[PDB]
Amino acid sequence: MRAMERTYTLVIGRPVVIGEKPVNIEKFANTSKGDAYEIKDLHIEFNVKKDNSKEPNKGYVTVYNLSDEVVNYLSVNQRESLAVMLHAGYNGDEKLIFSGTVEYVEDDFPEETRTTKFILGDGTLNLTTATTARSYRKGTPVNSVLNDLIADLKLPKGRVIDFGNQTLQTSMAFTGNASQNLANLAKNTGSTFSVQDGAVYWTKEGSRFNVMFEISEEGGMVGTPTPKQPSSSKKLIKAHDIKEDVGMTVSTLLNGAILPESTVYLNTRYHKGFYKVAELTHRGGYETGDWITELGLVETRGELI
Amino acid sequence: VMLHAGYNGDEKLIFSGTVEYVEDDFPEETRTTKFILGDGTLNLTTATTARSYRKGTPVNSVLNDLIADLKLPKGRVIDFGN
Amino acid sequence: MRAMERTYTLVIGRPVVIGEKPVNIEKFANTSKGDAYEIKDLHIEFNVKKDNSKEPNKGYVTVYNLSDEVVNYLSVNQRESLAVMLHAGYNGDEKLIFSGTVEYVEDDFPEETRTTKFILGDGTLNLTTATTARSYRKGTPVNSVLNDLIADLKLPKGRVIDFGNQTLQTSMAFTGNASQNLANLAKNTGSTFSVQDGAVYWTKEGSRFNVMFEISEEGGMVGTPTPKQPSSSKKLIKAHDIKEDVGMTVSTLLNGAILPESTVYLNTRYHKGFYKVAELTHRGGYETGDWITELGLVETRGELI
Amino acid sequence: ISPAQQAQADKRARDAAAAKRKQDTEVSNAKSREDIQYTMFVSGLRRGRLNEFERKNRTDDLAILFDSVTTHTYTKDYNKSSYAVESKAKASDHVTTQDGKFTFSGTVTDSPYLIDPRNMIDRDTDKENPMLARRPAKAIEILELIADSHQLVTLVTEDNILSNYVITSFQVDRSSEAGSSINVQVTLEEFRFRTSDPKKAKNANTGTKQTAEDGAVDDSAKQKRQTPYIGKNAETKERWENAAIGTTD
Amino acid sequence: ISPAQQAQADKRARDAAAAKRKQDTEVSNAKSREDIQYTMFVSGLRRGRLNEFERKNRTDDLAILFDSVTTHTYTKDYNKSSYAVESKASDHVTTQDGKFTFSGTVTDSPYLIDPRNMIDRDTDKENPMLARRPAKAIEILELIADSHQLVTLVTEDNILSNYVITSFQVDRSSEAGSSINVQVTLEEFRFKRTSDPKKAKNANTGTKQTAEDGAVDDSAKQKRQTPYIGKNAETKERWENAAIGTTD
Amino acid sequence: RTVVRTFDFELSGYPDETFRVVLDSVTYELRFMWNERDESWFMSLGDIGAQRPTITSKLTCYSDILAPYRYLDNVPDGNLYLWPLGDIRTRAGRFNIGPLKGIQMTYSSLIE
Amino acid sequence: RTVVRTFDFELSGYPDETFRVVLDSVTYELRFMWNERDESWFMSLGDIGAQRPTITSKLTCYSDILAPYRYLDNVPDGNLYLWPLGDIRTRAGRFNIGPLKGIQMTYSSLIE
Amino acid sequence: LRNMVRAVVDENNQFNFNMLIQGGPN
Amino acid sequence: LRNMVRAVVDENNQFNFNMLIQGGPN
Amino acid sequence: LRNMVRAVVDENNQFNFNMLIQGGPN
């Protein structure tokens, strides 16, 4: 008989180079020598937050007592963006939990124990340097503008909801970073745009997608759900009506197969119903600490897209 | 929301406003409710105006015109004179 | 036989008054009575950070159980900028470690012990109020523009590297604070501008000045050097190339005879070579605490100016 | 003060400085010898473990024996995590193993009974005049050398054999209760983890490398003099390096 | 109140202030001369340590002997990372400072009054109790600790150097009257001008300002210039003012 | 073609050393492999993070290693040579490479 | 050439003192080396962080040290002299330099 | 024990976010 | 014990306010 | 003990600086 013990894996690959086609962090895993630097049995502490907004998802990691060779490989490439993937689970499988580029790295080795630090960004390089220069005339179909701008961003299309037969009412011009322009189109058309684990997600506010996840005491829930406001401020109201404005909170054992834009079903004894996801935070302490995930849910009032 | 405090014989008004934020966390033993209250936040951050005046207008008139727009009681004002 | 014990001195002088010539904090030390208020044998905690950037270097200080007379002298002059100097060393000498103006001061005396607080700025008054209004035509030599703007700033010239026979390509106009205009000229010409302990330093990025300091176990080093990135973010690269982009970290016993723009030689058993300095932080606890200095080094790839 | 007192001051600097040099150099000699291993025989010597005491040659495999070991103990530990559930109860998650700790107490007497030369403490002890041999002192400078050099000790106990243990602390008490002996206590914990054939070696890394500090180009940075050549084969070298290498100028 | 009390409060302040001038002055000079070297003999003596006890004079290498030492203990400590290492990575350990402590006693009825001991500098031979030996020891003990001397310990087995006193205790219990029990604690010290130019090394002093109250610093503090003593006022005068000028 | 000495190398003897160096303000990564049967060092040169090395060659004394390769945008234009400090007949070995070990591996850069 | 006294120096006697000073609002670094056979102080003057000192000279009493060097943009235009406070016949020594030690090293600046 | 500190830092960050983003029609 | 933490957070906020608002004629 | 708190405050400041300054060609 065994116990139920945690497991994880961390991989470091070649520098990421942006080209003239969508970037996939998967293909950069292999190093010039072939197999990548894998780190399994070392105490690790990490925190990974995810959201549906302009900003990329960022995660922090700490590793104790790394071998000198690995640290040397990171002393080099300090000018470059190494690709990194993280996996976690329970002794039988490990689900992808983050993938991005090493934004920052530093080492402090006071006496007894060295402590390496990381800051990782989910597509930070693309979202902050992809320039654009486009224009359109009166009568252009809005569905064409959306596709044109996304292709400029150079990322795979996770999911998109086209506008239909919508047409521009006035001439438009777009410059600067493509991400910023798209985030502005979100406000005026009730659409949510956010990149996550390399995938572009374009959806409509208020509406939600089946029960892709069910939460219950069998599903490793942790404590009862509690109602928490989804924003730190309140807006004036007429009392688009379809927009968000309500939510709840839940916690569960670590499970990387969840994304901010997904949908979950809450099977508890007090609260029951369907909710959207709005925010994720993954925490982990291998030898000591939690191994759980926190979800911020938001009520929905739109159509079932 | 209103809040009162004192010493066992009387309670003086100490704050009055609107509940800007509220959240609940109930880990195991004890629930802990949180609040953030604002003193007139809604009025101060949404009261729009559109006014103009010409050369020679008395400044004392401009002040009164703008305050009435803000839609709040006048606690105390010191007019500008002439 | 003795031990190796710490020593320090703190001096407070007249209010600083800016005039029509370079400001020297040295000449304001003497008070109307003559000798200044010197504080030697009182527990003191201080933190002083230094850098090479637009912002001035600021340091914090705390003193316990000051006499009422000294506190009274600071209750007055609360509208004015008193000049302050700080010294530290080891029982045989004390090196100047900071000099500036008292930006802030507050006193809290709960029951047993009063605790005075300070915030000091290195040339804050000059860098934030020196206005300018200058213009030049096509063909003007850039070397003339640089000297004209620095004289406006009213500070002594610590060190400057002239541009040679460079000439303006387009007409230029400068207004507002002189420091801001100079910091803009830095970006477009690969030059570093930063005031420090009253001295103006204008150098060129990438290049460095002899071994003015050597670090080794004999030189009171504290722990081994570790590689740390010199910035909290990574820039996109073509992979001016001469710019920085790499660095290291070291710690040493307190030594005020070091400046951000200097050069150091690192004689350790793993790392060996020459580095620039980029950042300093001086910490100190007289009765209890550290008495060390931290240096952030940056690799260089330019000519040996 | 006086000129004569300057000589007295100089003595302090020299003798005090000379003392640390002897200690520091000796410690530096350790951590440089990798063909040396230290083993401590806490117990079992007279029951089965005599087989291992015969394998040590007093030159590179050394044995530490104690005149008496009062007690020894061994305690391993584990950590168990726990998370709360909505049923107002607590569940459990993975667990971890926390290395392991070992301690023992012993005594070294200035009047030994069993003086075995194979024991490394008795390397120089006189057979017929033990009390003047300074056994109690001779054990401190050898025990301290092992600890301060961070040796990986191996313990041969009667119950089992432990390896990769690092000393953490020890004590020496010359209490008036016993006298003519030293009471010794020690603690250890498990420190759980070039040459050689090219076939077995794999790709290493060294990171960024600056100019070598043992040859020219550093002197130009350190502002020093280049070393003159020793003349041999002149007029053959100078023509070629001067044309193919040049000089740092 | 009355003037009679003002002539009394002054006495209370004057005598109390005189105490610091005595104690505070002694430590100052004790630190202003590094030639003296203190040593302590805990046990050791009769097992051949007399070879170095006789080296101690009465002016530079002062020695201290207690009437009795009951126990002394020596200990060192080390620490290691509590997390599994990455593998040999044997550098994950550090060394702490060794500690030394012992207990002793000083009695009014000594059995051995060897004058070489600094406790017995000027003790009477025939009346040891009137000499007040316990008071002699405490006066010595505080001065050594206060001045932060690097003491040297001579022990049974080994010899320790560069040890500083961090705490000591004194008491006079009802039992063992006419004597005092003493405890001491010491720790290692990892310590790391008129000098031979051949041994000199490049040094630094940072930025420096006008040095000391000079002819120019006096003006800054509004002090009046020091008059020149007229040993000669014919040669320098014509040149001093013309070439050096005056602060003004 | 005036040239000035500007860099020197050292090898610890490990059969698979790999490290990064900066030459002419540009940065490159180097790999050194020891061959048993031929008792010689194999050097590979390439860009940082490159998939494959740009140049691979065998090291020998008094031979211009880069001679046939000064036509690529990512290859130094200087001179790389190995010459001995001791007797001229000594050939490159494993442990005898360094500023004082017997063989002086050096890089020199043309004056522009 | 009117001049006013504006700075004074002191030396601790250490044979290789080095420190930074500010004169005429400009900053310079100074080095002092003691010569045994000639029993005299050697002074070197240069800019902060300079590779080599701009001026080197031997210190003597009543001699204008900077006289032949007031033609460089990085040399003070003032007057640097050493004169004694005691008997006029005393020459510069090792420990006798300072505001009260016997010799007054001083700098004075012209009035502009 | 870092758990206690992280909570206070989080609360302070929350207060600052509220201060920046408050009221408003947009 | 939260008293100790609140003090440090307050001091850090004070330093940041000083950094933002400094010098200037207005 | 303030040493422990200062470290966490420093790390939070570092995270905020990274959030403000990231990516970008300039």
The kind and range of the H/E element at I12 are: helix I2-20
Of D187, D162, D154, nearest to D72 by C-alpha is: D187
Spatial distance between the Cα atoms of F104 and G3, rounded to a whole number of angstroms: 60
Q: Is J3 on the interface with C (CB under 8 A)?
A: no
Spatial distance between the Cα atoms of A252 and D91, rounded to a whole number of angstroms: 13
Cα distance from D207 to chain F (closest Cα, Å)? 5
Q: Is G26 on the interface with C (CB under 8 A)?
A: yes
Q: Position of tokens 């400029």?
A: A152
Length of chain D: 249
State the alpha helices, DSSP H only, in chain E. 3-31, 50-53, 133-146, 217-220, 235-243
Residue C120 dihedral angles phi and psi, to the nearest 5°? -115, 145
Cα–Cα–Cα angle for C208, C209, C211, nearest 5°?
Answer: 110
How far is CA E29 from its chain centroid? 9
Q: Is E163 exposed, middle or buried (0-12, 13-18, 19+ CB in 10 A)?
A: buried
| Token reading at D145 | 């050398």
Spatial distance between the Cα atoms of A194 and A123, rounded to a whole number of angstroms: 11
Cα distance from H25 to chain A (closest Cα, Å)? 6
Using an 8 Å CB-CB cutoff, list chain E residues near A42: 83-84, 86
Using an 8 Å CB-CB cutoff, list chain H residues near A233: 18, 21-23
By the 8 A CB rule, do E40 and E62 touch?
no
Q: How far apart are the first and last CA of chain G?
A: 10
Residue pairs spanning H and I at CB distance below 8 A: 11
Q: Is C211 on the interface with D (CB under 8 A)?
A: yes
The beta-carbon neighbor of H17 closest among A232, A235, A236 is A232
Q: Is C138 on the interface with F (CB under 8 A)?
A: no
Cβ-based neighbours of A126, under 8 Å, separated by 6 or more: A18, A23, A153, A154, A155, A195
- Report CB contact under 8 Å: F20, D208: yes
Whole-angstrom CA distances from H8 to A280, B43, D83, D141, F77 are 20, 31, 22, 51, 59
Neighbouring C-alpha atoms within 13 Å toward the C-beta of C142: 16
Q: What is the dihedral of CA F10, F12, F13, F18, to 10 degrees?
A: -80
Of E20, E18, E38, E53, nearest to E140 by C-alpha is: E38
How far is CA E16 from its chain centroid? 24
Q: Which residue of F has its CA nearest to A75?
A: F20
3-state helix/strand/coil string of D75-88 = EEEEEEEEEEECCC
Cα–Cα–Cα angle for C50, C51, C54, nearest 5°?
Answer: 120
Q: Is E58 on the interface with D (CB under 8 A)?
A: no
Length of chain I: 26
- The two beta strands, A58-64 and F103-110, are unpaired
Q: Is A147 helix (H, G, I), strand (E, B) or coil?
A: helix
| Token reading at E238 | 């014509």
- Report CB contact under 8 Å: C128, I24: yes
By the 8 A CB rule, do G75 and G66 touch?
yes
Using an 8 Å CB-CB cutoff, list chain H residues near A232: 14, 17-18, 21
- Report CB contact under 8 Å: D8, E161: no
Longest Cα separation, chain G: 42
By the 8 A CB rule, do A252 and A222 touch?
yes
By the 8 A CB rule, do G3 and E246 touch?
no
Cβ-based neighbours of G31, under 8 Å, separated by 6 or more: E202, G16, G17, G18, G43, G44, G53
Using an 8 Å CB-CB cutoff, list chain C residues near G50: 209-210
Q: Tell which F residues from 8 to 67 touch D, by Cβ distance under 8 Å.
A: 8-10, 12-22, 34, 36, 62, 64
Spatial distance between the Cα atoms of A182 and A142, rounded to a whole number of angstroms: 12
Residue pairs spanning C and D at CB distance below 8 A: 16
Spatial distance between the Cα atoms of E134 and E141, rounded to a whole number of angstroms: 11
Spatial distance between the Cα atoms of J21 and J3, rounded to a whole number of angstroms: 27
By the 8 A CB rule, do E102 and E186 touch?
no
Q: Position of tokens 């926190």?
A: A294
Spatial distance between the Cα atoms of C44 and C115, rounded to a whole number of angstroms: 10
Spatial distance between the Cα atoms of A209 and G75, rounded to a whole number of angstroms: 79
| Token reading at G64 | 């204008």
Of F54, F63, F6, nearest to F31 by C-alpha is: F54
State the alpha helices, DSSP H only, in C171-291. 178-187
Whole-angstrom CA distances from C196 to A217, D110, G12, I17 are 62, 67, 27, 22
The beta-carbon neighbor of E86 closest among A42, A112, A287 is A42
Q: Which one of B28, B29, B30, B31 makes the best mutation probe of the D interface by having the most chain D beta carbons within 10 Å? A: B28
Q: Tell me which amino acid residue D179 is.
A: G
By the 8 A CB rule, do D101 and D62 touch?
no
DSSP A15-78: EP---SS---GGGG-SBTTBS-EEE-SS-EEEEEEEESSSSPPEEEEEEES--HHHHHHHHTTT
Q: Is E58 helix (H, G, I), strand (E, B) or coil?
A: coil
Q: Is A64 on the interface with D (CB under 8 A)?
A: no
Q: Position of tokens 């302590």?
A: E40
Of E136, A250, C239, C66, nearest to D86 by C-alpha is: A250
Using an 8 Å CB-CB cutoff, list chain G residues near C157: 25-27
| Token reading at A137 | 């005339």
- Report CB contact under 8 Å: I2, H8: yes
Of C99, C16, C32, nearest to E221 by C-alpha is: C32
Q: Is A178 helix (H, G, I), strand (E, B) or coil?
A: helix
- Report CB contact under 8 Å: C301, F22: yes
The kind and range of the H/E element at E71 are: strand E68-80
Q: Which one of C272, C275, C297, C301 makes the best mutation probe of the D interface by having the most chain D beta carbons within 10 Å? A: C272
Q: Is D208 on the interface with C (CB under 8 A)?
A: yes
Q: Is A107 on the interface with E (CB under 8 A)?
A: no
Q: Which residue of B has its CA nearest to H26?
A: B46
Cβ-based neighbours of D116, under 8 Å, separated by 6 or more: D65, D122
Q: Is B75 exposed, middle or buried (0-12, 13-18, 19+ CB in 10 A)?
A: exposed
Q: Is F51 helix (H, G, I), strand (E, B) or coil?
A: coil
| Token reading at C12 | 């407070």
Spatial distance between the Cα atoms of E39 and D16, rounded to a whole number of angstroms: 13
How far is CA H18 from its chain centroid? 7
E70: left (phi over 0), alpha (psi -120 to 50) or beta: alpha
Q: Which residue of A has its CA nearest to J25?
A: A129
Structure's resolution in angstroms: 3.2
Cβ-based neighbours of A145, under 8 Å, separated by 6 or more: A134, A136, A168, A172, A185
- Report CB contact under 8 Å: J4, H9: no
Residue pairs spanning C and J at CB distance below 8 A: 14
Cβ-based neighbours of A66, under 8 Å, separated by 6 or more: A39, A42, A114, A116, E86
| Token reading at D166 | 């690092």
Longest Cα separation, chain D: 93
Spatial distance between the Cα atoms of A281 and G5, rounded to a whole number of angstroms: 69
Q: What number of other Cβ atoms are within 10 A of residue D244's Cβ?
A: 16
Using an 8 Å CB-CB cutoff, list chain A residues near J23: 121, 124-125, 127-129
| Token reading at A230 | 């989804």
Q: How far apart are the first and last CA of chain C?
A: 47
The kind and range of the H/E element at A293 are: strand A292-298
Whole-angstrom CA distances from C133 to C126, C130, C152, C163 are 16, 10, 10, 22
Spatial distance between the Cα atoms of A118 and C229, rounded to a whole number of angstroms: 11
Q: Is I9 helix (H, G, I), strand (E, B) or coil?
A: helix
Q: Is C181 helix (H, G, I), strand (E, B) or coil?
A: helix
Q: What is the dihedral of CA E39, E41, E42, E44, to 10 degrees?
A: 130
- Return the CA Rg of chain H: 12
- Report CB contact under 8 Å: D222, C1: no
Spatial distance between the Cα atoms of D137 and E34, rounded to a whole number of angstroms: 32
Helix axes A142-153, A178-187, angle to 10 degrees: 150
Residue C73 dihedral angles phi and psi, to the nearest 5°? -60, -25
Cα distance from G27 to chain E (closest Cα, Å)? 9
Spatial distance between the Cα atoms of E191 and A208, rounded to a whole number of angstroms: 70
Length of chain B: 82
Spatial distance between the Cα atoms of A228 and A250, rounded to a whole number of angstroms: 10
- Report CB contact under 8 Å: D205, A287: no
Q: What is the dihedral of CA F47, F48, F50, F56, to 10 degrees?
A: 50
DSSP G41-80: EEEEEE-TT-SS-SEEEE--TT--TTGGGTTSTTS--SEE
Cβ-based neighbours of E122, under 8 Å, separated by 6 or more: none
Q: Which one of H11, H16, H17, H22 makes the best mutation probe of the B interface by having the most chain B beta carbons within 10 Å? A: H22
Spatial distance between the Cα atoms of D86 and A219, rounded to a whole number of angstroms: 11
| Token reading at A201 | 């997600």
**b/e string for C131-161 if b means 16 or more Cβ within 10 A?**
ebeeebeeeeebeebbeebbebbbbbbbbbe
Q: Is E128 exposed, middle or buried (0-12, 13-18, 19+ CB in 10 A)?
A: middle
Using an 8 Å CB-CB cutoff, list chain I residues near J5: 4-5, 8
Whole-angstrom CA distances from C218 to C214, C250, E140 are 10, 14, 35
